[PDB]
Amino acid sequence: NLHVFTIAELRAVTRDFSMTNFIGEGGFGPVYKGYVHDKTKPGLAAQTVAVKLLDQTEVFFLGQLRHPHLVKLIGYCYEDEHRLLVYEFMTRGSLEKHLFKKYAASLPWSTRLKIAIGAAKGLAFLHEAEKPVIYRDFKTSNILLDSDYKAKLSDFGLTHVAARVMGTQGYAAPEYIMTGHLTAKSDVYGYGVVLLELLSGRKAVDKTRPPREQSLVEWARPYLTDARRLDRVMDPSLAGQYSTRAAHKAAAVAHQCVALNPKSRPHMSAVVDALEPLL
Ligand SMILES: Nc1ncnc2c1ncn2[C@@H]1O[C@H](COP(=O)(O)OP(=O)(O)O)[C@@H](O)[C@H]1O
């Protein structure tokens, strides 16, 4: 379930938190990769791990949130002032590092659909949990990928107008930005943006695009209902791998998730139901 580590154990796991194992500064603190051997913890198989240094009832609750499309929380360390979390390591890292490549040759249409479906299943599970788990803003980088490009959600369960909107890159739900109201439907909005990114291969907000195209959502929304002009939106790298019907339906799923009205947005289980026939 959840293992307890000491700092000394996590030093052995991470080579004393060597900068060679530094993975990046995350939303909640620095992240290091590590390796647990078969003998490190009884009942835990040898595997690569991510160790997060955070800059608890909640952590025990996070250890009960088990699902094939959530990153596994393996354990934790609370020692001195320090709070560390130990996660399964996602071999291919976050979706944003693959999706916005110029060519993204390892992400053909069916792999993108598989990623959209797994992310939707993870979010549906979180939304249907004993306590609703909702993100502050569901973004591309909350989707991590294993070696088979299986999607697993990360950082799950972990104001005034200016502070809500400052530094957002297009994933925060409209109603959260303007009123601060956060519900499961706010995640669905961000999921819809990521789905548009998967269909187009373009970042939600790109300042280097022409001003009419800088916001993916505003630019794409009028074409999502136009089946003959949907190819303006679709990733040119995907040409030939989808039918017009398949692209139109996935675009309609995205269209519904990015509705400005939260009441129009689907439940994530309905998104799963809509996308699986495409695969
Ligand atoms: N479980 C994990 N497996 C692999 N890489 C991870 C894991 N958790 C976080 N990372 C990576 O660590 C870095 C910072 O952590 P995170 O907060 O998830 O990313 P970001 O900085 O994009 O918000 C990112 O490169 C992210 O992909």
Author numbering: 4 to 58, 69 to 171, 181 to 301
Describing publication, verbatim:
We identified ScRIPK, a member of the RLCK VII subfamily, by a screen for sugarcane orthologs of Arabidopsis RIPK and rice GUDK. Thus, ScRIPK is a member of the RLCK VII subfamily localized in the plasma membrane. Furthermore, bacterial growth was measured to determine the bacterial proliferation inside plants, showing that transgenic plants exhibited significantly higher bacterial proliferation than that in wild-type plants at 3 days. These results suggest that ScRIPK plays role in regulating drought tolerance and disease defense in Arabidopsis.
We also analyzed the ScRIPK-KD activation loopresidues that mediated the kinase functions. This activation loop contains three phosphorylation sites, namely, T250, S253, and T254, as indicated by the electron density.
